[PDB]
């Protein structure tokens, strides 16, 4: 099911969706299982009382947490491989950095290969440079366009002075190919 060799590394560095994806909880609280004809669902009720979270999964996948248990904010709900995007969105930048470094180092340590972590950290830093705009504001940035963090910060710094509304963005993780082709030098 899961990739195990060089394809695993290629998948990790391309920020692709893993094969054996294992959904992770979005909010801590209570968990219940809803069995359906030709489909299964996990419903999570947060202690805050906000909206429920529904994770649909297939019959084959083996559950990891029983019904009515207590789940943490970053707790897996199934056996598989966590995807970088969800962990980033739910636990910030440091969590995804640690996750990517550890996952990349496991593959190499399996075959007894030694590499320092600064080499991996350089690439991981190059993968987390740009931010995606979700609020238009009045900073001359359209929603949904990726901008390097430096440009976005200097734009907001100019706007905040002698201006009211900044622009708000969200961190974005992109693979090596998309990051390399989206450069400033044609």
């Amino acid at each position: 099911d899961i990739t195990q060799g060089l394809p695993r590394v290629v998948e990790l560095f391309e920020a692709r969706q893993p094969k054996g994806v294992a959904p992770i909880s979005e909010a801590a609280g209570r968990v219940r299982i809803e069995e359906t004809e030709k489909t299964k669902k996990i419903v999570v009720t947060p202690d805050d009382g906000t909206d429920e979270t529904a994770f649909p999964i297939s019959k084959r996948a083996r559950l990891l947490v029983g019904e009515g248990d207590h789940v943490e904010v970053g707790q897996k709900l199934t056996v598989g491989a966590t995807n970088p995007h969800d962990v980033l969105r739910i636990l910030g930048q440091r969590a995804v950095q640690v996750h990517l470094v550890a996952e990349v180092q496991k593959v190499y340590n399996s075959q007894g290969v030694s590499i320092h972590d600064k080499h991996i950290e350089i690439i991981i830093r190059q993968m987390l440079r740009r931010v995606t705009i979700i609020e238009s504001g009045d900073a001359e940035l359209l929603p949904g366009e990726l901008v390097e963090r430096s440009k976005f910060e200097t734009e907001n710094r100019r706007v905040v002075t002698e201006g009211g509304h900044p622009a708000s963005g969200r961190p974005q993780l992109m693979g090596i190919t998309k990051a390399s082709l989206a450069t400033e030098s044609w």
Side-chain angles (χ1 to χ4, degrees):
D1 195 327
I2 53 163
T3 50
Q4 193 173 4
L6 189 64
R8 175 55 167 160
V9 171
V10 173
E11 188 178 61
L12 273 160
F13 277 121
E14 293 284 357
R16 281 170 189 167
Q17 183 174 170
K19 310 309 302 188
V21 193
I24 67 171
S25 178
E26 183 143 40
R30 197 60 45 186
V31 66
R32 65 194 190 80
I33 300 167
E34 175 171 344
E35 204 286 326
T36 308
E37 177 260 3
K38 300 284 285 187
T39 298
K40 209 187 293 191
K41 176 161 282 194
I42 296 91
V43 180
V44 190
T45 306
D47 299 349
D48 311 340
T50 64
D51 194 325
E52 310 289 329
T53 311
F55 298 105
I57 55 165
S58 65
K59 167 178 161 188
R60 281 280 181 164
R62 172 168 90 271
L63 273 288
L64 187 144
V65 184
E67 172 159 17
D69 311 344
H70 196 238
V71 287
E72 288 290 355
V73 181
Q75 177 167 348
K76 272 167 63 174
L77 303 178
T78 318
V79 72
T82 318
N83 66 332
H85 298 286
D86 291 331
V87 59
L88 162 54
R89 167 166 46 76
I90 300 158
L91 323 173
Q93 284 211 143
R94 189 77 186 96
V96 63
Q97 287 163 2
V98 174
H99 167 78
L100 289 158
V101 173
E103 285 290 327
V104 169
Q105 272 286 74
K106 280 177 195 167
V107 172
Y108 283 112
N109 280 339
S110 172
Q111 272 84 340
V113 172
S114 194
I115 306 169
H116 210 281
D117 282 24
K118 54 179 68 166
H119 300 155
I120 301 159
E121 280 182 3
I122 277 160
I123 309 303
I124 296 298
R125 187 179 72 137
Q126 291 287 117
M127 285 166 57
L128 286 153
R129 279 182 67 185
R130 311 184 201 284
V131 74
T132 195
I133 306 296
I134 55 173
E135 191 69 6
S136 315
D138 56 339
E140 295 78 41
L141 307 168
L142 310 180
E145 66 183 1
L146 282 72
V147 289
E148 314 75 40
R149 208 178 296 278
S150 67
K151 196 192 306 314
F152 161 88
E153 294 293 328
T154 186
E155 188 78 15
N156 272 1
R157 283 169 78 170
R158 183 180 56 69
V159 167
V160 294
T161 61
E162 72 261 20
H165 286 87
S168 69
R170 194 183 66 261
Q172 199 76 36
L173 182 89
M174 57 210 311
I176 60 185
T177 306
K178 288 278 164 287
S180 50
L181 279 170
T183 179
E184 280 274 90
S185 183
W186 57 273

